[PDB]
């Protein structure tokens, strides 16, 4: 049973082991085939294998619903390299290729083992009789819904087409349904379980957010006499973890505006921590050179706009400081998460001010208004604002920082080992929050 999976994992996919025990558990739950399965794992965590490997071990065919043809083509190309009998039914096909594939699907024992299809195609009149005979001959082993968050108006990429999939899942009652995505809050997950008609109990495999080696804190700029000086000492502590070597590792400072970038770089450089600005304002050549200087550790600190952001990863980022609050919890998570990739201790600090909150609050309304003029209203618009309010709440509440990140994304209470300001000294955080209330 576990041997069949290991055998196929090697002989077909050419892997000695699963990337993670979570990927393994997901894969085994799909193989057993007794439950609907929800897989929520970031890009690169091997989500695809969690349905592709079980598809090869089942007796019948696996249908994979994916929302655009670019995405479909990605895995078809890869599975073909593996000598897997994959097909795609889409309109980027000759009328002849379409008919050849529909004919294959009418066979007792189709050549096709895995079929990739758009939600458009899965509903189209052309396909219904094919789908019906696949049902009738009990040839469907799995229905897979990729990008399952697209069914939710509260996710970032709602698609009406996805609303038909619950009906499809119901008709394919014989077969287990696997739904996958990189991105789902608890509300998006509840929408996925309801709108796709997933059968309870739904087995869930969700990669935790929690980063044990990241120390999170929020500082209130309004309560600090020398903000720039506070930031410099933060940089010094974080870059000072091997004093013998001198300066060790690197850091990112995130800012809202190009001006603030340029200015923060000058202020830091003055105070003894060499920092260079990286933003859309610079010539392409200047950006390549600044990024290079950071990558090769000529310059230890890079100051970037949240808007332009960072194009490249680095293993020894010892700190990420948000000078200005980010636009969303997800943005903050991703930007701060550039820290500590090598697994060594790193520091993530958010410099909060109600003045910054109000600036961003309003800019978000403006960018939402601009989208509403060009394409009308959308429940995503409310999502964008709540995504920011979650981060404001993170800044203004007392409570474990890792716990607040976990709660937003729908993870279990994480094991913070005095790994944030509130868990290290609850009273000091309370002190600072009480002080911020007085400045109101």
């Amino acid at each position: 049973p576990e041997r069949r999976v290991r055998s196929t994992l090697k002989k077909v996919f050419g892997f000695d082991s699963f990337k993670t025990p979570l990927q393994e558990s997901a894969t085994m739950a799909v193989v057993k085939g007794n439950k609907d399965v929800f897989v929520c794992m970031p890009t690169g965590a091997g989500k695809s294998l969690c349905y592709q490997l079980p598809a090869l071990l089942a007796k019948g065919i696996t249908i994979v619903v994916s929302p655009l043809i670019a995405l479909i083509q990605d895995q078809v190309d890869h599975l073909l390299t593996l000598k897997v009998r994959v097909s795609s039914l889409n309109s980027k096909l000759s009328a002849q290729e379409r008919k050849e594939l529909l004919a294959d699907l009418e066979r007792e024992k189709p050549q096709t083992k895995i079929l990739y299809i758009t939600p458009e195609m899965a509903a189209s009149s052309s396909f219904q009789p094919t789908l019906n005979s696949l049902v009738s001959r009990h040839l469907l082993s799995y229905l897979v819904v990729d990008e399952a968050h697209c069914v939710s108006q509260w996710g970032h990429d709602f698609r009406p087409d996805y609303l038909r999939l619950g009906a499809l899942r119901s008709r394919l009652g014989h077969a287990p349904c696997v739904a996958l995505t990189a991105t789902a809050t608890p509300q998006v997950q509840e929408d996925v379980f309801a709108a796709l008609h997933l059968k309870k109990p739904v087995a869930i495999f969700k990669t935790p957010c929690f980063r044990a080696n990241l120390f999170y804190d929020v500082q209130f700029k309004e309560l600090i006499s020398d903000p720039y000086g506070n930031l410099k000492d933060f940089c010094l502590k974080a870059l000072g973890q091997e004093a013998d070597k001198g300066l060790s590792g690197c850091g990112i400072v995130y800012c809202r505006t190009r001006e603030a970038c340029e200015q923060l770089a000058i202020e830091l450089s003055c105070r003894g921590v060499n920092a260079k600005a990286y933003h859309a304002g610079l010539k392409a050549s200047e950006r390549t050179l600044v990024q290079n200087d950071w990558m090769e550790e000529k310059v230890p600190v890079i100051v970037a706009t949240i808007s332009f952001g960072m194009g490249v990863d680095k293993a020894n980022v010892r700190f990420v400081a948000h000078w200005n609050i980010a636009k969303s919890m997800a943005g903050y998570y991703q930007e701060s998460g550039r820290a500590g990739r090598d697994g060594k201790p790193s520091w993530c600090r958010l410099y909060y001010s109600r003045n910054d909150r109000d600036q961003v609050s309003f800019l978000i309304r403006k960018e939402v208004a601009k989208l509403q003029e060009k394409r009308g209203n959308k429940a995503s618009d409310k999502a964008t604002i709540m995504a920011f309010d979650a981060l404001v709440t993170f800044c203004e509440e007392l409570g474990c920082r890792h716990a607040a990140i976990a709660k937003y994304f729908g993870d279990a209470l994480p094991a913070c080992a005095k790994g944030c300001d509130h868990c290290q000294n609850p009273t000091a955080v309370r002190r600072r929050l009480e002080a911020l209330e007085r400045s109101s």
Partner: nanobody, 124 residues
Framework: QVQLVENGGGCVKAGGSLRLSCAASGSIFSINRMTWYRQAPGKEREWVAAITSGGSTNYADSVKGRFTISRDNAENTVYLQMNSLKPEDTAVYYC???????????????????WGQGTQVMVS
């Protein structure tokens, strides 16, 4: 998975009060709808009261005013305060945990409905 264990049920005189408590065990993140049911001897199950996560409540007409459903968010526990009890209220009371999201720090979880065991309520 999850255990729903109801308590607070006991023999009581008419006009009196009880408070029923249902505790939900396990790695619970959230419960969509929590509903109080009761089963009177030789009657069909009767819907009593429900509370959403969010605290929106609703009551059968036979109990509105007398019964109040509430939640301790901290403890995954719901309460049914019952005042002005009548013989008609004599039943076994159990709770339904509809849309229960469980999840371990490993990232393995479940979405399911759970049913309690029942607590005996006897009104003289």
């Amino acid at each position: 998975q999850v255990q729903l264990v109801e308590n607070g049920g006991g023999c009581v005189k008419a006009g009196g009060s009880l408070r029923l408590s249902c505790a939900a065990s396990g790695s619970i993140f959230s419960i969509n709808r929590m509903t109080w049911y009761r089963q009177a001897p030789g009657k069909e199950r009767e819907w009593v009261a429900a509370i959403t996560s969010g605290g929106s409540t609703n009551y059968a007409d036979s109990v509105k005013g007398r019964f109040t459903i509430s939640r301790d968010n901290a403890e995954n526990t719901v309460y049914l305060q019952m005042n002005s009890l009548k013989p008609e209220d004599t039943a076994v009371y159990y709770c339904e945990a509809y849309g229960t999201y469980t999840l371990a720090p490993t990232g393995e979880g479940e979405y399911d409905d759970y049913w309690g065991q029942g607590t005996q309520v006897m009104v003289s």
